[PDB]
Every structure is written in structure tokens, then in C-alpha cells.
Amino acid sequence: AFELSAAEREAIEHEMHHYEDPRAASIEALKIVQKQRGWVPDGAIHAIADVLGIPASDVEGVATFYSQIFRQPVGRHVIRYCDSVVCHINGYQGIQAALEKKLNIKPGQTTFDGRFTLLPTCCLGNCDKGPNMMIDEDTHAHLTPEAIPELLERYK
Amino acid sequence: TEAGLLGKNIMGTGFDFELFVHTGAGRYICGEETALINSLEGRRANPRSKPPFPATSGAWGKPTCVNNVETLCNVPAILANGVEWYQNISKSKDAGTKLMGFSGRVKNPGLWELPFGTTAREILEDYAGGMRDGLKFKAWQPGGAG
Amino acid sequence: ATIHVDGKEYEVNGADNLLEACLSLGLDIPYFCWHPALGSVGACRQCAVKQYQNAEDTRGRLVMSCMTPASDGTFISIDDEEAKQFRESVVEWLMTNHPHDCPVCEEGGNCHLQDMTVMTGHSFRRYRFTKRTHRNQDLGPFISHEMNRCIACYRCVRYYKDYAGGTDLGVYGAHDNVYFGRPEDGTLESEFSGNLVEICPTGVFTDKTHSERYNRKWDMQFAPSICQQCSIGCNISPGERYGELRRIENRYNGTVNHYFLCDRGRFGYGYVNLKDRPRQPVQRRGDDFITLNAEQAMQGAADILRQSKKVIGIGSPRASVESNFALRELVGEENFYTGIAHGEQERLQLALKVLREGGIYTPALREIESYDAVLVLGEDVTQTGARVALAVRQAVKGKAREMAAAQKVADWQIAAILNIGQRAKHPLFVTNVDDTRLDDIAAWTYRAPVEDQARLGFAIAHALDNSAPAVDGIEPELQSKIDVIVQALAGAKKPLIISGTNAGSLEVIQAAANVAKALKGRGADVGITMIARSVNSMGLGIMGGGSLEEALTELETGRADAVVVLENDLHRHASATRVNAALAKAPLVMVVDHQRTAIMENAHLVLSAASFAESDGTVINNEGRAQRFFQVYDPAYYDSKTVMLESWRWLHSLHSTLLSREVDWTQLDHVIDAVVAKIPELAGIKDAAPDATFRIRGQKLAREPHRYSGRTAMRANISVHEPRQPQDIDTMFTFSMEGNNQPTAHRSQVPFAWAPGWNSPQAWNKFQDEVGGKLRFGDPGVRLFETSENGLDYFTSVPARFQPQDGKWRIAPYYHLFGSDELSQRAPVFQSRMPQPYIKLNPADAAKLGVNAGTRVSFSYDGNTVTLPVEIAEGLTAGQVGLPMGMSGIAPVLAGAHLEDLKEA
Numbered sequence A: 001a002f003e004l005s006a007a008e009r010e011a012i013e014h015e016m017h018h019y020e021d022p023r024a025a026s027i028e029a030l031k032i033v034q035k036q037r038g039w040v041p042d043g044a045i046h047a048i049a050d051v052l053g054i055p056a057s058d059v060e061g062v063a064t065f066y067s068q069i070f071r072q073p074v075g076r077h078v079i080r081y082c083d084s085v086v087c088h089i090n091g092y093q094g095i096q097a098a099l100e101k102k103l104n105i106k107p108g109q110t111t112f113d114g115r116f117t118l119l120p121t122c123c124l125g126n127c128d129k130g131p132n133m134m135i136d137e138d139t140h141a142h143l144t145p146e147a148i149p150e151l152l153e154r155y156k
Numbered sequence B: 001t002e003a004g005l006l007g008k009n010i011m012g013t014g015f016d017f018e019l020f021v022h023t024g025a026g027r028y029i030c031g032e033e034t035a036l037i038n039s040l041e042g043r044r045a046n047p048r049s050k051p052p053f054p055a056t057s058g059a060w061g062k063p064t065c066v067n068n069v070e071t072l073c074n075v076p077a078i079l080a081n082g083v084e085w086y087q088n089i090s091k092s093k094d095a096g097t098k099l100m101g102f103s104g105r106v107k108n109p110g111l112w113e114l115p116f117g118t119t120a121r122e123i124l125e126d127y128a129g130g131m132r133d134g135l136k137f138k139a140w141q142p143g144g145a146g
Numbered sequence C: 001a002t003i004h005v006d007g008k009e010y011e012v013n014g015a016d017n018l019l020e021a022c023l024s025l026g027l028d029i030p031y032f033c034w035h036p037a038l039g040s041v042g043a044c045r046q047c048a049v050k051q052y053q054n055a056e057d058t059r060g061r062l063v064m065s066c067m068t069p070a071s072d073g074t075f076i077s078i079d080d081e082e083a084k085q086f087r088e089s090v091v092e093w094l095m096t097n098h099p100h101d102c103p104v105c106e107e108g109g110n111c112h113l114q115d116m117t118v119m120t121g122h123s124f125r126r127y128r129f130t131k132r133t134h135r136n137q138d139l140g141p142f143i144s145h146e147m148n149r150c151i152a153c154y155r156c157v158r159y160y161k162d163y164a165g166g167t168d169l170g171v172y173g174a175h176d177n178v179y180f181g182r183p184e185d186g187t188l189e190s191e192f193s194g195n196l197v198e199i200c201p202t203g204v205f206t207d208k209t210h211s212e213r214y215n216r217k218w219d220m221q222f223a224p225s226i227c228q229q230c231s232i233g234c235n236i237s238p239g240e241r242y243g244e245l246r247r248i249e250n251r252y253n254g255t256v257n258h259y260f261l262c263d264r265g266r267f268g269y270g271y272v273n274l275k276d277r278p279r280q281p282v283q284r285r286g287d288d289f290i291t292l293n294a295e296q297a298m299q300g301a302a303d304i305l306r307q308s309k310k311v312i313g314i315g316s317p318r319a320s321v322e323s324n325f326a327l328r329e330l331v332g333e334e335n336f337y338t339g340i341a342h343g344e345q346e347r348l349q350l351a352l353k354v355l356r357e358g359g360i361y362t363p364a365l366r367e368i369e370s371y372d373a374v375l376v377l378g379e380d381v382t383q384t385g386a387r388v389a390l391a392v393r394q395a396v397k398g399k400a401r402e403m404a405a406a407q408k409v410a411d412w413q414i415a416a417i418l419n420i421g422q423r424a425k426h427p428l429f430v431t432n433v434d435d436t437r438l439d440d441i442a443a444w445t446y447r448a449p450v451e452d453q454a455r456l457g458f459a460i461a462h463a464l465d466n467s468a469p470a471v472d473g474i475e476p477e478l479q480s481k482i483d484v485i486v487q488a489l490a491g492a493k494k495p496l497i498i499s500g501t502n503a504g505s506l507e508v509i510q511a512a513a514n515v516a517k518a519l520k521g522r523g524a525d526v527g528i529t530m531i532a533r534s535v536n537s538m539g540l541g542i543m544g545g546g547s548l549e550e551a552l553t554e555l556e557t558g559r560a561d562a563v564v565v566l567e568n569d570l571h572r573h574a575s576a577t578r579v580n581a582a583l584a585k586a587p588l589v590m591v592v593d594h595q596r597t598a599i600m601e602n603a604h605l606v607l608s609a610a611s612f613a614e615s616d617g618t619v620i621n622n623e624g625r626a627q628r629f630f631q632v633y634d635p636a637y638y639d640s641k642t643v644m645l646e647s648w649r650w651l652h653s654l655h656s657t658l659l660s661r662e663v664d665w666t667q668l669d670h671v672i673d674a675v676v677a678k679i680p681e682l683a684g685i686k687d688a689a690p691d692a693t694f695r696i697r698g699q700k701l702a703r704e705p706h707r708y709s710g711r712t713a714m715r716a717n718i719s720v721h722e723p724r725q726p727q728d729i730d731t732m733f734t735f736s737m738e739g740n741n742q743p744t745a746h747r748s749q750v751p752f753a754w755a756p757g758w759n760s761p762q763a764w765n766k767f768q769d770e771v772g773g774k775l776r777f778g779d780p781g782v783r784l785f786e787t788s789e790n791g792l793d794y795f796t797s798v799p800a801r802f803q804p805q806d807g808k809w810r811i812a813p814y815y816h817l818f819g820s821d822e823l824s825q826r827a828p829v830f831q832s833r834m835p836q837p838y839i840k841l842n843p844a845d846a847a848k849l850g851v852n853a854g855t856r857v858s859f860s861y862d863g864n865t866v867t868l869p870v871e872i873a874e875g876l877t878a879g880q881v882g883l884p885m886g887m888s889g890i891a892p893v894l895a896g897a898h899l900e901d902l903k904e905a
């Protein structure tokens, strides 16, 4: 049971006249559904395929190729801590240990109440202020393991 | 767009041009030129073998050229302040400037601009100011993770 | 060109890539991601060779031979240590995550990956870490899925998407977690999903029908045969074991069906293994169906024919040329009737007249792929001649191929072909009563009744050439679409008009003939293709005879008191009540058949004939090419009481017993000579295959591989004494190991592909002169007729518009790939793939009757009321009603006929 809304369909069409190929709006349509629901369910792939005209296999391959498009359901807030080389020099291991101590989950798993989802990510473009952690609209920098409980309590 | 800088009739020249911003979806391989072209078309970001070449058949088979942000920002200086003046900035085989800097357990990480021919030690104790207390120079990597 | 391989001079084609040039010369290079039909992408990194810049170079450069063109003076090395080390390393990297599954994998002994692991010499493992696993999707009843065995070579997605034009198979994920399959569980909707079991080098896609009763490739008894499920006549290798037909492999024919079959011809073989088949002759005395052997059955049949006043014979288009001709000799050519109806025979004879008298070259199925514009008139190609639909898809992608070739891109750079050819494709205009499976690539699809489709063709012919009869009553936007089609066909170098007898309209065939003639008159290299219904429909049309209605009138009037029905159920071509009444009036009915049909209850004698797996013969495909199919196995080898002879053998011995009162089990070559003596229009079937005296350096051709096992134990449960090896007096093959299957043998009928080190279906590379080309020493089969010098004239009979009359409903044929050919519906694995019988209605007609979707409505035809659930078809026109041809109770003769009393049940 899936149905694209009028606003989502209008946004997808608005992205569609930007390019000369309706296939080129597949990533942006998936991101639109991602913003408007939090994850891409099973019927959303078929809905995007029906709206765009490309087959559902292409939309499924695009959704599963990119890491920032989620096909499994997540919590209200996602945690994307950087684990690349500069943040490894800056010591993201203490941040990961503090996150696993607080949330009592594993990287890739979600909490029982859906409060947070612990994920690693790629480079965040904030090497000079590493380590960095990406929440939905915030790029937290200069992370310390003592400040992790203070930072996690401001998101509900 | 409200100032007429993009769209139709750009200051009476008649050249038609428009720019759109496409956000990525989190994959490192998208940075390659052929893979960027493939991901722009809405497919999986797989690179294309040479031959063919993206200058001949790039985005949707059309002529397409992809340039870096730093190259597209160095272009106005070359065009406006002359060509021979741009050649007279760095006296080496490479002509121009470059955004440079250090990162990772240093005193002053950041970004500055340096001409070609600058030695790597001149950013350590001058711009970065060295490292923190009790750290020995074991290794360094110049051009990112690759 | 000129290449230097390890110092040896070789002459190759300059346009070919280095891998295909070296494979054509017999040199062994490991490869996974390259296929001759799918092009090249360079994923598997397996075909590395060291290329040198000049004659004296030491280091060289490792290069990929599937990307490197075979230019003149190209110096390469294959067996030098660096290239072998790299290829062994690539095999080792493929072997890191590969499961320990070879004993429990259906591809064992038939695996490309096993062959290339052994060829590279990699046998020692130094990987000690974990191996990735994947969950297995459900792909339906045909294809079994196992994603642990994948090597990410991207051949399946390339074939299924680019070649086959499918939409529900893709690659998901990144790095080493790439998954190949559907987005969810479901049946693979493509009609050519079965070719994945040969395209995939590993055991990801396996034959599930074979997996139910599985045996290895070395244990299979193979024969070269022709698929009997439609008129296209794709060459196949049926392989059997323990007396049952086990698998249908693709047999390479560079003219017809090179690497690919369709799903009906690959998985519809299950009727051979049915347990209700007649195995011994049966005579009904009183109500006792007693069982005879061959001799007393022949003697009693000859007697009971001898004191009859007239004997008639009803042949079938399922039967071969030899069996129908033997029936024709038995009953006389005056009393011989074809088993098809009058309208079907009229359409078939018109199609034959267009093919062999129209002056337009009918193309081979491989040659269909090299045409620039395709107009399909009235024929549902994907549901009736599916391999022609695949070739039409290739011809449509030919525009992208030509556009790439105009910009210095070779034909094997398929990625650059699709890059240059983004959405431009050759013009395809399909016409049907509803939507087809070619509409995703068609430049236009015309949904109209068959009269309107014929009128569209007539208008196209008149607009192309004014000498054709004009059409009055064309709506202006439809006229603009006619102009678009005419502009597409006139600019094409090689146009192709495809029609057939499945539409149930003579006028569509006439319109297609006139379009082909008009395009011929302009100077174009036009071709015409005609799709018939059954395997030997063209052969029965060439042989000729009366229609089934004449035979039924002869039986009902009483002029004939003896009827011999050869391999015909008689209900697909005439109404059941009339056939049953005629066969009940006839005091002697003799059914020579290999499938238990409904008319055997009225039959007085049943001669247990043999199917294609247990018989030889010749069949003529839709293009007029005679092709010989050979016996796969002896039926009596395992069950000694089985008397299952060839139909021509039964009828020839019956004729001999009727004449001179002794049985004569003849030889196949004698019947071939009798055909080419009595019937000069079938005189080309002698050249279809050599006779039984044909040898390769003195020895015959082996049916089974060199490692055929269990020969002293496969029949040990019946008797510990080994039986006779079955003697083959008919053909050049032997039912044994002791024969010849060398790839360089001067022969054209190859039972199976096997080479030392190439156990996969890639041994066809060894069996070809050049890879992706023809079979070496010529492809098997011969065209019966050449292209005529003078053509036909324009058919002036332009049909009127379709006027929907009240109370009468025009039956629109909706063919199904699984359910239309009768023998395929008999197969038990097709009963889950076929759809439920739904009657298709227009929304306006459904509103007129007030019935919704899914409601059961009843209709009466020939005094019998049958109920079906209603499906709403938007693409249908008003006044018509869609019916599935070929299913149980809905004969294909119903197409184009009126229907009465359409009301809700």
C-alpha cells in the first residue's frame, strides 16, 4: 500500500524538467521520498518507476547503489559519524565507543524505540575540525567522548 | 537569475545558458568524470572505458566537459588579469596557484593559497605552526587518501 | 590483418577484437564477461594478453584482448609468464568467495567457471577468511536462483536488458555485494528468460525443470533435433537419461537460432515424459482395450482396411514430412486430407504463395537482425514466433549500432553503442488487436480489428506506390500516421514486413504482400517474413490436401468408412461435436499418435507413434527451410514391451501389409527418396542431412559423450545381462559412445558441443569456423525454394471497415507463449506458468452488459455453453471480444469468427 502525494509528485516533475532525460531525476526523486518519509519502502520503487517511466529494476539499483538512500526503515534521527583516515587520526574510536555505550546498539542497528540509528559515513569535508558527526541538519565537530551524552540529549 | 546573469540575453551577448545544482547521494566513485556523467544521467555510477572519450560522447552522448571548482575559480583570474601576468606568478613548469594546507594533529589546520614551487616544509612551521606536544614526524600524505 | 601470436603468423579479420580473433583460431584464452552476441564490457578482467609495440620488445604491456582490436601486424603473447600469472590471479580472486557447492550444483561438468579455473592451472587455495553469502530469490518455475555462485560478470543483465529487452532483472548494491536478480520475488516476465541458464557462466541461473530430474552432462544422451513448438524451427539438443527426456539445450545454428531459444521451446518438452502416452498398440474389441505388438496390430489393421470401401487419411501439421507423406501413400493423394480447417489452409497457402512466388527474398532468422525498418502486420510475434520478436529487437537496436559505427566505434563496444544510441532506434510499427510485448520499443502500435489492420496495410501500400488499390475512409490523423510509416519505410535501406497466419485474416496477409511488393518496386531491399502456426505447417501446405471440413463431410455422408488420423487431436481445427459425431459414424477409426487425445475413445485402433524425441524426420520451418531431426533414444531400451515406432514406419508397414500381406519396417532414407520422387516441390529435403551411410573417416556420429557412465548398471535392476545397443538404421548417428563428435569433423549436424577443456556451452566456439558466425562446414538445413524472378500482383480485395453488429461478437485472438501450442499445454510445468482462461472485454461493452472485472460470463458456440471470468482490456475495440487461442475448449480455429449469446452467467 503506497501512494505518492501531490506535493511529492509535483516536486518530482519539477526536478524532471530540469534535465532532458526523466531517468536523470531518479536520484533526486529517491531523495525527495527520503526527505518526505525517512526511508524508501518497497512500493516507492514501483511508484518512482511508474512516474518516471524507467523500469523498477533501474530504480532499485539506483536506490541500493548509493549509501545515503535508505531502503530499510530507520529511526527518527540518524547518526552518521565520520570514520575516515583524518578522523581516525583524531580518534573516532572513543566517539564510537561512547555512542555504543549510550545507545546500547551496534553500528547499522537501530534502537528499540527508534530514537537513533548508528551509522558510519564517508568523508564529511570537515577534516580540519575532525572528528565530525552528521545528524539530519547538523555537522557536529570537535567531538569528545564526554560531550556525547550532552549532544545526544538535545535531539528527541 | 534576478540580475540577468543566467538565462536568456546575458548583457546583450545573446548566449543562452542555464545552470542547475544536482546533489549527490554518497558514493566516492561518483567523483570520476565518466562515473559523474553516468550518475548525472540517473544510472549507477559506473565508469566508462576509453575509447570512447567524454569530450566526444559525454552526458547523454552529447559533448560534455567536467571541471573542478578550483579550476573554474582560477579561470576568471586568468581571463581578467591577463595571461602573461598569470604566467608570471609561479616560475616553474606548473603555472598558477593552488589551495594548500595540512590536517590532522597539527597546531593550525586550515586552507591557504600558495604558488607552485613551494616546499612542503614551509607549511609545517609557518602556516600550520608544527604539531602538538611530543609528536614525531613519522609520515605524511600529500594528495588525500588516494 | 596480420597478428603474431607467440611468434606464429596468423591471418584474422581486422574489425574483430583480439579475443574473438584468437578464439576463432583455436587458441585458448580464459574469458567470462565476453559473449559473441552481447558485445563486450571488460568486467571480468580475465582475457589478459601481453601486447608488444614492435617486433623486438621485452616488457610489453598487459592488455585486455576483448577491448584490443586485431589490427594489422599486432604482436601479442598469451602463454608468457606475466599474462598467465595475472589470469591465474583473477581466477583466484573469483575463487575467494565462491561456495563449496560443485557436487550439489546443477552446472557441475557444464560450468564455464570450472573450465577456466582448470585452464589457468589454479588449484591451490591460500584464502583463509570468510566468504560472502546471498539469499536466493524465487524466479518462477523455469529458472532456479542461487546468488552465492555469482562472479559479477554482468552477462545476465547485459543479455536480459540490452539483448532480450527485459525489465525485471538488474544489479543492486556496490563493491563485492552486487546482487543480480529481480527487485522482489516473482516470475521472470521475459519470454527469453530461459537463455540465462546458458548466458550465465556459473550456477546462478539453472534449469529448474532439469533440476527436478537432474543428471550431469556426460550422462546425457543427446541428439540434434528441431523444436516442435512453433513454426520457427529452432535447432535444439534434446538430451535424455533413463528413458525420459531430461533437458533441451540450445544447438548452435548460425542461420536460425544461434545462441538463443525461447521459453516455450526450452521448457515445453514435458509432454514427452507424460505417463498417459500410448506405448504399445491397442485394439478395442467390444469394450476391452486389449494390447497388441507391432505385427498383429499391422495385420489386423491391414485386414480391417482391406474390406473397407474407402479409406481417408487426416494428417497434421505437427507430423513430419515423411509421416504425412506415408499417410498420403497409404490412402492415396485424392483421399488424403490435411488436418487443418479451410480458412487456416487458405491463409497458409496464401502465405506459401507469397513466400515462394512473390519475388521478395524471405530472410533467415539470423538475417532479420540486419534490417533497418520493421512493419509487423497482424502477427503477435512474441506469443507465436518469439525468436522472431527477439531478432526484431536486435534489428531495432541496429540504428544505435549504425550511429555508433558512424563515429569510429566497433560493433563489440556495446557500452559505447548504448552511449551514442541513447534513445534513437530503428522504426518498428506493430499492429494487433491489442497491445503486444514489442510495444516498449515500437515506434508505433496500432490496436484495431484485423479488418482495420489489413486496411492500414493496404493504405500503406497505396501511399508507397499509387499502383496499389487505394483505401477510402481513412481518418486524417490516421492518414498522418500512415505518412509517418511510409516515410520511415521509404528511407530504410532494408525494410522488413512481417505477417503470418495467426491473425486469422487472409486480408492481413494480402496487405503485407502488397506492402512488400510496393517497397520492392521502389528499389528497396525489402524482405518478408511469414509466421505459421505449427512445426510443419509450411510442409503440410507444400504437400497439400483437402481441408478437415471435407474429411468430416466424407465421414458424415458415409463415403468413407475408414479414417486414419495421424498425430491430430482434430479439436483444434474443427468443432468438437462435429468431429465426435463424424468419428462415431465411421465404423473404423485408427489414430496414429504419441499423445493421449480425446478422439482415442472413439478410436478402434491406436498406433502408439513416437514423438520427436523417439523419431526421425524432416520439418519445414516458416521460412521454407527443410530441417532434419534425429531420434534421441530408443524407447524399448529400458521397457522391452514398449512398441513405440515412427509414424512413417507405422504407415509404411501398414501400406505394405495392405498391399502384399507382410510387414515392412522400412528405412528413413527410403521414405526421403519416395518424397523427393513423388513430390518435386519437396525435392530439397534430401539435402537437409546426409543419409545413414554418412561416416566421418569410417565412423558414425556419437549421440552421447565420451564419459557416458553406468552402462553396466543403468539397466541392472531389470536384468544383470546388458541388453543390445540399439541399432540405428535410419540415421548417421549411433545410440552409443562409439562415434565421432570432433569439432573439426566435416559435418553439420552437431548433437552437442564438447571440447577438451571446454565443457560449458562455450564449446560452440570450438565448433564454429569463427566465433559468433556460422557453424563450420556450413549450417545444417536447406531452403526449399529460391526467390522468384517475377513477383505477384497487387491484391485488389481491400476489406471494408469493421462494423460492430448487435448480438454478434468478433473473436479477437490472444495467443499465449505458454498455452497455445497443444503439446506445451500438455507439459506439467506449463500449468503453473500459463494464465487462467480470461475472456477479454472492452470497457464500453462491459458497461453495456453491466459486468465488471472478474465476473463469470457464459457464451455459447456450436451449441455448447462455456463460462469464463472477464478481464477488461482497454486496448481492445468495441464490438470485439478477446479469447485465448489454443487453450482447452478454445480452439485456434475460433479466431476471426463471430460469437453468439454473450451474457452474464
Ligand SMILES: Cc1cc2nc3c(=O)[nH]c(=O)nc-3n(C[C@H](O)[C@H](O)[C@H](O)COP(=O)(O)O)c2cc1C
Binding pocket: B028, B029, B030, B031, B032, B033, B066, B067, B068, B069, B071
Ligand atoms: C576515483 C576518483 C575520484 C575522484 N573524486 C573527485 C572528487 O571527489 N572531486 C573532484 O573535484 N575531483 C575528483 N576526481 C578527479 C576528477 O573526477 C577527474 O579525474 C579529473 O581529474 C578532473 O579534472 P579537473 O581538475 O580539470 O576538473 C576524482 C578522480 C578519480 C579517479
Ligand code: SF4
Binding pocket: C098, C099, C100, C101, C102, C105, C106, C107, C108, C109, C111, C112, C113, C114, C149, C201, C202, C203, C204
Ligand atoms: S557454478 Fe560452477 S564453480 Fe560454482 S559451484 Fe557450480 S559447478 Fe562449481
Ligand code: SF4
Binding pocket: C149, C150, C151, C152, C153, C154, C155, C156, C157, C180, C199, C200, C201, C202, C204, C205
Ligand atoms: S549471475 Fe551469472 S551472468 Fe550474472 S553477473 Fe553473475 S556470473 Fe555473470
Ligand code: SF4
Binding pocket: C227, C228, C229, C230, C231, C232, C233, C234, C261, C262, C263, C264, C265, C266, C384, C385, C386, C387, C388
Ligand atoms: S521460437 Fe518457436 S521454434 Fe524457437 S524455441 Fe520458441 S517455440 Fe521453439
Ligand code: FES
Binding pocket: A082, A083, A084, A085, A086, A087, A123, A124, A125, A126, A127, A130, A131, A132
Ligand atoms: S576525514 Fe572525517 S571529515 Fe574528512
Ligand code: FES
Binding pocket: C019, C030, C031, C032, C033, C034, C041, C042, C043, C044, C045, C046, C047, C064, C065, C066, C067
Ligand atoms: S572477457 Fe575481456 S575482460 Fe572479460
Ligand SMILES: [Ca+2]
Binding pocket: C614, C615, C616, C631, C646, C730
Ligand atoms: Ca529411428
